[PDB]
RNA sequence: GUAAUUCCAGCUCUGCGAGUUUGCUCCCAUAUUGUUGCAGUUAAAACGCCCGUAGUCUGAAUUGGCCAGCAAUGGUCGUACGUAUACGUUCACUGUGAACAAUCAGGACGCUUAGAGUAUGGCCACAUGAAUGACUCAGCGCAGUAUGAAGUCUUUGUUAAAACAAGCUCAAUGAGAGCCAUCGGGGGUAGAUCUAUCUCAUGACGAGUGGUGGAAUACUUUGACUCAUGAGAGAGAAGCUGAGGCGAAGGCGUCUACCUAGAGGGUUUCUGUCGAUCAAGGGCGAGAGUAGGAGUAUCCAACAGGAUUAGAGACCCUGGUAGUUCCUACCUUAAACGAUGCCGACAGGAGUUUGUCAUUUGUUAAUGGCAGAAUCUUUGGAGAAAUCAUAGUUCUUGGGCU
RNA sequence: UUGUACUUAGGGUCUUUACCUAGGUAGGCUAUCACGGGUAACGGGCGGUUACCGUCGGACUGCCGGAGAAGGCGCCUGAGAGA
């Protein structure tokens, strides 16, 4: 039967959509079917205190990659972006996050 | 829904009837005839001499040898395989003899463990196995 | 209240409310303005949706202008009921 | 916008309940016959005259003044246009996307729409020939479309 | 497209009375108003108001709650008398209630009506 | 398959009974042939989409109200004043009437009963009965007009000058056309633009670079790999990009000018039923594929090596032509999927959101209207269940077509 | 579909007609299924099965009407026969 009233893909209204990467696999996926907008210090952490003593410029602030990621469904599995959950909590449609 | 109820749209519901009775096998196999080439060729019982005596045996699970006899038919002088029922029985029906065969009661298709054969013996020498094999008449 | 509407007799909120024709007697919503520019005195009939940008006589810029719905009064403009 | 299309449209006009009426304006029954026949002297099709009478004069609906239709005051003073108006603006579009398909002919967008068009002519075409407004051997042609709208 | 209107206003009836409404609002007719001045008769509904729009109409019923279905059946086949007592064990559920609406030639009325003026004709559809 | 409640025998018991099994054909069982009366999201089953003829289907409107009712009817309100006591549309449908053996149903009668048969019953010469209905659609007559049809040549019709109020209804939350201000990756043509990749030329350096689970084939001091500038090529438009928009579906994302289509909204514009659905028939139709030109950067069926493996015609790696791009002809298929045909009505709340209008200075907002697009739910009903505001209104069975 | 469809004139017949022979037109039937093919097809009153609707069978059917005398074909006699 239909698991999904979705079908695991998000799209309304249209019969056709963009591919993109997963950035293991490589394969092509349609654009509408696991994004994660990605926010890392380009340093690190550990390294960032070392690299302040020999930074000309005082202060300074130590930038940020940014990346967009697009995965699939076999790569985001094996990875644990997503995982397979419950009956009654596949529903559930917003992430982890909670607030008052 | 699903057809036409108008009132002047008969000739659509009695067209697409006539259409509707091909699905259906059993005007099907009726109307074809489509039955004339057939062993039987539609008679429920048909006679004609022994060719020979054989041994078919059952399907499975049912290990079993059967003992069906190899018989020419009167009428069309085709050959087919026939099952004798009872125990003993084959013994009494002797070779070259005439011998009346009629079907195996399934209305065609094969029956128990048996493939293949579709005919059962019912008389021998103007007889019948019954009386034989329970022995109130004899055979010379 | 699902079950319970009074239908015969609604409020004067739910004839405003409601479609232009979904009404219990169908008539518009539309009517003809007088006009005025305070430049003349010259009193002009118009239809408030229109299609045509509305003139008096005398002067030369339209007195109303047309977009979807209403008419778009321009410059200080009024309306005498009538 | 239902016949050729996807959509279900419900927006139109609604007649006002008191068809006759309004005492309070200020009009005349031998009076709007003349300005009817003004603008159709000067080539206005009857959709048209109707709007510049109520934008003008503030006649809401013309019928509620003389008791007559607009079409059948041009008929009775013996001066409407010879086509019906739906129909010549169908043939006027037609004419003028066929022109485009001449010039670049990858649009199958106008193609499909040509058609849709050119089936809805036909579809009128049919029933004005059963009124007896145009005659059992009338047609439309790519060739007879330029003298039909001139 | 409306094919029919008698066929659909008794649907909207019956959608009114299993909802258990005070009230319904129905394009009107002239046989759709004998329909329900028939079953009025035999007391299964209230008491309707007929309005103008210089248009097709509205109807405005009130329901008394006191009914199960309207059906209007179609196509309109031809009944008389002697092939009636079929098409009351057909349509019905019982025998001892429920009454079906065909227009006779002197008018439309029930079957209990048209046995006693002895006029057949086509018949609409049924309430009960 | 050596403990047989189904074999072969005995004994007891059961059924039906002058009957009782066994073949083939055939109806019921079977709403598994569906007019009544099935089913089509996933079980078999909705054309890939749009036009569209035959076909079937086709909104409202026309002589009634009131009183006595138990109906048939009979009075009153309205006078509408043609033929010159009968004539002023025909049908379908309904009632009634004509017309047209046995069997079937059914009346009479104790053939001793029954199946049958047309008889038979009264002691004084008599009385009878051999009905009626159905068989039945078409064709024929009179009577009734609720529903459903046809009848109704108008830029002026019917019996010079008349008369008929001469006349062609409404303006449908049917449809078409017009007009107004918006909206959108609807389609087409042409030119720029932005990085990226590859190639080539110049300079810098000096042993590896690639690639992998690990390696090797591969390219490298005739200087690759990285770094910098410069020129060319063909392909593509990142991020914004979302259960967002448009398009009949297939499908459609830089910017600019060009020709083109239309949905939705508003409308005291116009016409007046022009419409719904559809065998044939006609077009559009992803990607692959074919034919002929123009291209050829990337990636790459085949193919060639290298690994791994028992083998590896594969998965992994390095190279690679057809194809991938444009133009002209074709092909006509997909899980062309909402696996849900199209038009129409009604039935429940809740807050999202796209377009647009309305009343407000909560004006990039609030409340409400139509038209989209999804969603939620302790709601009803349906379903085999999964689930579904349609898959609901369906043994409480009939809106219209395929 | 080529006497195939109409028309005018004739022959022939118990009469009417392409029934047949002439002259003159070029027509008729068809998606409301023509034409062609199949039938383990004589038609009908009716019979079997059934809750209704239907459905299967109908040589016989204790009757009605048609056709045939081993297979075509032809003819005399007669009110009537291709016996």
């Given at each position: ?100 | ?24 096998n059993?005007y099907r196999r009726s109307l074809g005839t489509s039955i004339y080439k057939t062993?039987?060729?539609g ?65 065609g ?32 | ?82 | ?150 | ?128």
């Amino acid at each position: 039967p239909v698991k999904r009233r979705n079908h695991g893909r998000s799209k309304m209204n249209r019969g056709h959509t963009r591919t993109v990467n997963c950035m293991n696999c490589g394969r092509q996926v349609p654009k509408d079917k696991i994004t994660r907008f990605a926010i890392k210090n380009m340093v690190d952490a550990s390294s960032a205190k070392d690299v302040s003593d020999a930074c000309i410029y005082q202060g300074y602030e130590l930038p940020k990659t940014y990346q967009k990621q697009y995965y699939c469904v076999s790569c985001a599995v094996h990875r644990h972006v997503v995982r397979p959950r419950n009956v009654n909590v596949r529903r559930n449609r917003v992430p982890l996050f909670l607030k008052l | 829904k699903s057809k036409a109820c108008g009132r002047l749209a008969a000739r659509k519901l009695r067209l697409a009837h006539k259409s509707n009775l091909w699905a259906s096998n059993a005007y099907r196999r009726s109307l074809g005839t489509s039955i004339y080439k057939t062993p039987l060729e539609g008679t429920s019982m048909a006679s004609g001499i022994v060719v020979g005596k054989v041994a078919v045996e059952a399907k499975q699970p049912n290990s079993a040898i059967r003992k069906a006899v190899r018989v020419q038919l009167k009428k069309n002088s085709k050959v087919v395989t026939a099952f004798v029922p009872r125990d003993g029985s084959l013994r009494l029906i002797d070779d070259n003899d005439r011998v009346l065969i009629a079907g195996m009661g399934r209305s065609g298709r094969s029956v128990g463990d048996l493939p293949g054969c579709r005919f059962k013996v019912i008389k021998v020498a103007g007889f019948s196995l019954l009386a034989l094999w329970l022995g109130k008449k004899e055979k010379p | 209240t699902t079950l319970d509407v009074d239908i015969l007799h609604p409020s004067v909120e739910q004839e405003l409310h409601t479609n232009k024709k979904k009404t219990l007697v169908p008539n518009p919503r539309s009517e003809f303005l007088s006009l005025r520019c305070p430049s003349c005195t010259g009193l002009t009939t118009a239809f408030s949706h229109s299609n045509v940008p509305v003139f008096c006589k005398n002067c030369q810029t339209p007195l109303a202008t047309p977009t979807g719905g209403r008419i778009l009064l321009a410059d200080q403009v009024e309306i005498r009921p009538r | 916008g239902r016949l050729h299309s996807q959509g279900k449209g419900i927006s139109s006009s609604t007649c006002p309940y008191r068809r006759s009426a309004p005492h309070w304006l200020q009009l005349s029954a031998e009076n709007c016959v003349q300005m009817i026949c003004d603008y159709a002297k000067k080539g206005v099709r009857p959709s048209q005259i109707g709007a510049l009478l109520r934008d003008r004069n503030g006649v809401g609906m013309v019928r509620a003044v003389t008791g007559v239709k607009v079409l059948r005051i041009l008929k009775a003073n013996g001066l409407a246009p010879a086509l019906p108006e739906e129909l010549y603006h169908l043939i006027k579009k037609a004419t003028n996307v066929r022109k485009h398909l001449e010039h670049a002919k990858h649009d199958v967008d106008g193609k499909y729409r040509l058609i849709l068009i050119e089936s809805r002519i036909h579809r009128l075409t049919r029933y004005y020939k059963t009124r007896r407004v145009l005659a059992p051997n009338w047609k439309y042609n790519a060739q007879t479309a330029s003298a039909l709208v001139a | 497209v409306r094919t029919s209107v008698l066929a659909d206003a008794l649907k909207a009836i019956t959608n009114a009375e299993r909802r258990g409404m005070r009230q319904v609002l129905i394009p009107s007719s002239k046989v759709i108003i004998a329909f329900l001045k028939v079953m009025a008769s035999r007391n299964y509904i209230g008491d309707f108001e007929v309005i103008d729009d210089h248009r097709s109409g509205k109807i405005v019923i009130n329901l008394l709650g006191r009914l199960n279905k309207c059906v209007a059946i179609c196509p309109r086949f031809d009944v008389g008398l002697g092939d009636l007592e079929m098409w009351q064990a057909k349509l019905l559920p019982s025998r001892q209630f429920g009454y079906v609406v065909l227009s006779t030639d002197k008018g439309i009325m029930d079957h209990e009506e048209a046995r006693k003026h002895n006029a057949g004709g086509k018949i609409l559809g049924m309430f009960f």
